Every structure is written in C-alpha cells, then in structure tokens.
Amino acid sequence: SRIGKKTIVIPAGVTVTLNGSTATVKGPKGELVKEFNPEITINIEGNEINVSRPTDNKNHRALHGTTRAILNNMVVGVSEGYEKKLELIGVGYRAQKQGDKLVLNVGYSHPVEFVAPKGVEIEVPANTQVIVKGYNKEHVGELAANIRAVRPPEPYKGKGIRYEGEHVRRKEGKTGK
Amino acid sequence: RTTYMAKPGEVERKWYVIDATGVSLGRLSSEVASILRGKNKPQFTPHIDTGDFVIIINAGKIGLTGKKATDKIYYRHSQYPGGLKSRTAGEMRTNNPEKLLELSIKGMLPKNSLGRQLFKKLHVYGGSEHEHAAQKPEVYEL
Amino acid sequence: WIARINAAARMQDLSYSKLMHGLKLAGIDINRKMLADLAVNDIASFNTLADSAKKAL
Amino acid sequence: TKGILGRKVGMTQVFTENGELIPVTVIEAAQNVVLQKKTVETDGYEAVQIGFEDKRAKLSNKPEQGHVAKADTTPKRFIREFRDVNLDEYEIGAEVKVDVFAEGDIIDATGVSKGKGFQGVIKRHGQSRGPMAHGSRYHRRPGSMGPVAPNRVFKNKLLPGRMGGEQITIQNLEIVKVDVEKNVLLVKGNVPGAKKALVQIKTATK
Amino acid sequence: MKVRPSVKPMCEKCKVIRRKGKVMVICENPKHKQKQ
RNA sequence: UGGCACCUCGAUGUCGGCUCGUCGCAUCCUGGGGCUGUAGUCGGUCCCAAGGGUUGGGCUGUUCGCCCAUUAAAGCGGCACG
RNA sequence: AUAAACGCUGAAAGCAUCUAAGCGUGAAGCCCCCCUCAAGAUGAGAUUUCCCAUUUCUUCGGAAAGUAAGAUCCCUGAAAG
Ligand SMILES: [Mg+2]
Ligand SMILES: [Mg+2]
Ligand SMILES: [Mg+2]
Ligand SMILES: [Mg+2]
Ligand SMILES: [Mg+2]
Ligand SMILES: [Mg+2]
Ligand SMILES: [Mg+2]
Ligand SMILES: [Mg+2]
Ligand SMILES: [Zn+2]
C-alpha cells in the first residue's frame, strides 16, 4: 500500500488521540471519533502519524490503505472542512430557505423540504444554486446526494438538479425523419 | 455377574457456570451436552441420570462463523395449512439468545424420557448475571 | 466398560486409545471388565496402572 | 384515553340539529369506582381497575369484601381493567362518570355477542347450499372434506358447532349525547350483546 | 439491464467488474449494461 | 402424445358438473425497479414480488372453443385428470 | 429491517471503482401496529383479598375425623342451552 505508507502531517490547532483502536480528532471546526480494527496499528508523535502493516496478504493491505485514507480525510475535514455544490436547471426551478430549512420548487405540486443534521449546513447563494458544507466527507456527500436524488437530470432537456462536475448524456426527442 | 450400576440419587450432582463469549455454538453445545449426560464420570449408567447442572451466561455473545448470521434458518410449523415460519440465526442472537442455545443443545441430547429430563437441568442467560447464587455454582473451563 | 474407562482416564490426562496402547506396550493383560470395575471401586490402583501405561509410551 | 363500563338498555333514534335521523344505542353507566392501580414496579404493566355495579351483601363473600374495603365501597358485580390510560388521574375510591366523554367523541365498544346454539355450516360460516331439485340429495351439507393424498383432513375445515357468545369489538363509533343526571350515554349504531349486557366504552385506538 | 448467462463486452468502452459476487458489465451506453 | 408391464382381477367406481378447498410460481391485476426505436399520452421488454383479488350469460353431456355484455384483471398448473 | 435497484465514503491497484472494512435511500412482500384464542406454556407464570395452625391414633414415615374460608346436592328459571 503506497497510500498506507504515506505520512500524515498534523496541522496546527488540531489534536489527535488514541484510545485503543478508537481515534479522536479535534480542531477549529469540530470533533470526530472513529473505530478501526486492532490488527492495524498507529504511531503518535508531535506532528506525524504513521499506520503500519504487520502482514502482506490481501485484506490486510486493503485495510492499511483505507485506514490511512480515513485518517487523512478526518484530519483535513477537522482542519479546513468540506463542501459540495449543486445547480438547478429548468424553468420555474427555484431554491430557497426559511431559517434552517431548504425549500425546493422543482416542478411538483408541493415543495420539497430539507433539514440538515448536526455538523452540516446548507447555503443558498442564489435561487438556482445550493451549497452543502461540513467537516465530514461522508455526511456532506450523503446529503448532497439526497438533495440531488429529488430531481436528477434528464437526457432530453438537461432539466433537474446536478453537480457542476457532471456531464449529462444528452438524447434527441425526435429522430429518424 | 458383577458390574456396577448406579442408583437414583446416589451420585452427587454439581452446579457449573460456563461463559459463552466468543465460542462457536456447536463446540460449546457438544461439551455442555456431554456434561449434562454424565459421560465425564466413571459412574455413568445409561438408564440413570448421573450428570450435572449447567448455567450459561453471556449467551448473546456466542460466535457464528461464515455467513451463518444471515444465512442459517430455523423453521416452525403450526400444523395448519401453509403455517411455516422462518427465522434467521443472527436476529435470534440479538433477540432470543436463550432460545438459540436451547435449540442447539436440545438437538444433541437423546430423544426419550431421560433426554427431556436432562433438558431441564440447563439454564441460559443472555447477560452476565444469573439467579442461582443459592446453589453455589462453580466455574468450569471448556 | 469402554465408556467408563474413558471417563476415568481423562482425569489422568489421557485418552482411552492412548491408555490401551500404552497398556499393550507394557505387557499388561487386564481386560475391560476388570479395568472398569477397578475404576469405579478402587481408583488408586487404576491410577497406578495409568502411570505404568504412561511410562510405557 | 378514557374508559367506562355500562349496561346496554336498548335501541332507539334521535333527530339531529339539521333534521337528520340516526339510530342510537343507550348505555347506562352508574356506580363506577376506581378499585386498584397496577404499576410496573409491582405488576409489570400499568392499568386501572374499575368496578361497575352495586350488589347485595348476600351475593358476595369475604374475599370480595376485603378487596373492595381498600377503596371504601360496596361489592361490585363487574370488574375490568383498562390499559393505555394515565395513572396520574384515578385516585383510589374515586367515582367515574359519563362526563369523561363529550358529544362528538369516537370510541371502541367491547361486548359479548348474542348466543346461538348448535348451528350448521351455512348459517355458522355462510356456506352455499346445494340444489333443491333436479334429483339432488344434497342441501345443507358441509362439502368435501379434502383431497385423497394426505390420508387425513386438514385443520380449519369448517364444521357445525356452537355459534354465538364471543367477545366482539366495534371500532370508531360516535357519541351523540351525554346525560349526566341520568348517567346515560347515546352511541350511534349498535353494539354486541343482548339487553342488560355489559359493555366497555373506551377511546378509539386509531 | 440485460440478465444473461453470457455477459461479455459489446463495444470498446465496456468494462467487466464484479460486485457482490456477480460478474457484470458497465458502460457509457446504457444499452450495454449486463448482469450475470 | 408415447414406451415398459413393477402393485392391485377372493373388485384400487370410470367423463363432465355441484359443494369445499389447499398448495407451486414459469405473475393475469395491483406494488417496486433497469433498458427502450423512453419528448408527452399510450406502450414494449426484463428483474424483485405468491399479500389479497381474479364475471354473468347463448350453443353443445361436453373439457375445450366460438359468440354477447362487462371488469383493475377475467393466470397457468399439482393434489388417485383433488 | 430488507429484495430488485440507486448512491456516499474507500482501498486492494498513488488513478478509478456502490464493496473488500464502513454508511444511506429503497416494495401490496417480512417482523410489528389492528382483531380473537391462549399457563396441561408438566417451562403449569403474576397481582389483590379471605381462612388458619384443631382432635385422635401411629414406631418416624404417616393414617382418619370433625370443621374454617369456600363450594355443591336439591329446588324457581333465561339474557344460556
Ligand atoms: Mg437447524
Ligand atoms: Mg340463545
Ligand atoms: Mg340451543
Ligand atoms: Mg329432498
Ligand atoms: Mg384377489
Ligand atoms: Mg348456455
Ligand atoms: Mg375495464
Ligand atoms: Mg390436477
Ligand atoms: Zn459499451
């Protein structure tokens, strides 16, 4: 595992501690705690974290790599944070918010309501632009996916809710003549 | 001619506590059934009950290997047309560990009056405490 | 008889099969009936014979 | 969630404010008293026990007098338990009146149905009868008992037997009128049982 | 989706993967989605 | 549809209907989904799914079938052709 | 809580990947919610209340003979049969 061997440089202001297999990370933006399997081990010093691999067989290699990746994302999210962006395409498609509640008018007979969970926030720069922010990769990704699943893009006009980094496969409504 | 046969109530029966943490269901079941039958004593008599009493604690932490938690099934029939019911081993371990242990132990005891008598000497608890401190049970290692 | 001898020998850190093989190796010709009788009634002589078999192995 | 016990008096009709005409059942519910409260730390579950109708001292025995003497009341003909209630109400020895219900409430009515004796399949189970002519000799009989292969007949093959006298619950009945002075409750519709039968009136569970 | 015993690529962008113990083909063309 | 002749010839009642059903799923309707020669409407095909439901007549001993009028739909098979 | 399915995070395989560790949506179906039976559930459960420690024989075991609380025989019946 090239990933598993890489070093984690701890930024200033964030602290990492180990309670057995459990790991806790604190910093300016929040606190994370997570459990890993005991077969992998972690060293601790002032500003480097190294996860080591006792064995060279398959599952052990995969677990080494994923443990390093999870630690990296956890520390980065505590330190700088994470965000995702969403666009709305279509006539009458509108995004708004009332307090801590996102209201979407996406062509149904009723508006669609969203409330963010703890640690995650929703921001609306414009009526057709949504931003999900938080210090946890999984939760930000899950909430953005849940929002996008309300009205995914469609291939005949492009209407719907999509990421900026999406390429929609486009089709033609009438062909042959 | 001259061979020893034990009489009812003659051989003194003991109380044991066995911890079920991390042991496979079948391995523990085999040992416990052998203890209940009375096959660890030289006074074993096939038509007399000479075994001991067994308490099992932490039955919620019995082990299942492979995909037995989701793929092993227990069935019941009520004797009504179409009345078959199905239940997986893992969610019994979550909900009724005592039933799981009792079914496994019962399957490997003799099928007669004496076997039904021996089934009554087994007590199973899903937590770590039992109600039989007055019987002064003793720790037994598999 | 075999089941009773097995139970008696397991308390001496043996099996029935190992004990019987050892008693064969030592030239001892006591049959199952006498061994089980001795196990139930006179366990000290049973332990003596088990030590003899154990040394034979 | 409220509850009360009563006797079925009869069956009649009333005219509503609009001039409508609806059928009602009359329930008379005098002399209800709280007798006991069951709590989790003593019984395993929470309930309130209610006694309904006064009866003569000749018709009771020492255990009954002992049980009702804790609530300072005379022996009762009927006693039932109500669950899913609030035990912070219901003082021991208190009275329960038809005031607990108001016009427009929706209730559940529990009773024991009228008794029919030994009955056949087409009345007991709503079976279909055979031809009455065209040479037939098959009129009010149960039908085939089953196929040949099992060498036996299955369970739930419906046959004649005793018909009525079962516990029945009817849901979502409306209260039309409450008369406190007469201790009378008027319920739209009908309830199980014959006249003078015991009826439980409870708040609807759905 | 096409459910067949004979899952194999249909163009040069099809890719053969395994998920949950099943062999399958993913592609940009949705007509090429196959599961065994 | 056949082949064989293994139980039953000191008897294992044989078609259709009626009464009463129960089970399988290779699903007729209803529920969830992928692909479409999927713009919409109306459809096609495949995957999951057996919880419930699945019509009254004319002709013929008929099973089947044709026809009339409906229905969300008028499934196919096993049980000594139950 | 799941099926088919759609995803997030993510390595093995510095990328990519719905999968391997870990998460989320998701069916008239499963387990509940609703109605009825149910402790002979010989594993015979729980709560409240009532009566009490009598007299003869026995060699202990135990036996019998008057009762208490409570029920029945018998009789008038139906809302039951
Ligand atoms: Mg089994
Ligand atoms: Mg009657
Ligand atoms: Mg009658
Ligand atoms: Mg006639
Ligand atoms: Mg003959
Ligand atoms: Mg006709
Ligand atoms: Mg129609
Ligand atoms: Mg057939
Ligand atoms: Zn392709």
Side-chain angles (χ1 to χ4, degrees), chain D residues 63-94:
Chain D
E64 297 188 32
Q65 312 270 27
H67 178 69
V68 294
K70 290 160 74 73
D72 291 331
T73 196
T74 52
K76 292 290 177 269
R77 188 163 294 277
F78 306 104
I79 300 165
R80 293 295 185 273
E81 279 182 16
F82 291 82
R83 282 176 89 179
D84 304 307
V85 295
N86 195 11
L87 291 180
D88 284 332
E89 293 179 353
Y90 305 115
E91 294 307 281
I92 294 296

Side-chain angles (χ1 to χ4, degrees), chain B residues 33-45 50-52:
Chain B
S34 190
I35 294 165
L36 281 168
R37 182 85 177 97
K39 293 179 71 67
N40 302 131
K41 319 176 185 194
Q43 291 87 25
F44 170 73
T45 308
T50 45
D52 308 308

Side-chain angles (χ1 to χ4, degrees), chain B residues 72-75 103:
Chain B
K72 176 162 192 153
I73 311 288
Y74 292 90
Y75 293 99
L103 283 176

Side-chain angles (χ1 to χ4, degrees), chain B residues 78-128:
Chain B
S78 64
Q79 300 193 129
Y80 277 71
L84 183 83
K85 295 176 184 62
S86 199
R87 194 176 178 182
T88 72
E91 63 87 19
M92 293 180 183
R93 182 169 62 177
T94 302
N95 290 329
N96 296 114
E98 298 91 0
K99 286 191 192 294
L100 183 74
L101 276 296
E102 289 188 318
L103 283 176
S104 178
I105 301 279
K106 185 183 286 185
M108 57 181 80
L109 289 169
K111 278 81 188 175
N112 42 35
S113 305
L114 186 62
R116 298 188 290 262
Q117 273 315 288
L118 305 179
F119 178 75
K120 281 183 252 191
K121 299 152 63 194
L122 173 83
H123 307 86
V124 185
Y125 299 87
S128 78

Side-chain angles (χ1 to χ4, degrees), chain A residues 28-87:
Chain A
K29 308 190 89 76
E31 189 276 331
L32 274 301
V33 60
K34 184 178 184 293
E35 181 65 26
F36 306 91
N37 44 5
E39 184 178 1
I40 316 290
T41 180
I42 301 92
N43 66 359
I44 301 299
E45 62 86 20
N47 60 325
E48 295 195 22
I49 307 297
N50 301 128
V51 288
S52 79
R53 203 171 77 229
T55 315
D56 191 74
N57 63 6
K58 176 181 174 183
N59 69 334
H60 199 71
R61 289 193 311 273
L63 287 159
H64 192 189
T66 194
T67 302
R68 197 266 163 181
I70 292 305
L71 266 296
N72 188 315
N73 296 115
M74 185 180 288
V75 175
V76 165
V78 164
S79 70
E80 293 83 3
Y82 278 125
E83 85 169 5
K84 272 183 166 291
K85 292 181 181 179
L86 294 170
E87 293 179 353

Side-chain angles (χ1 to χ4, degrees), chain D residues 158-171:
Chain D
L158 307 180
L159 290 191
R162 208 165 276 184
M163 188 176 191
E166 292 175 329
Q167 184 182 119
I168 309 279
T169 299
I170 308 185
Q171 299 177 326

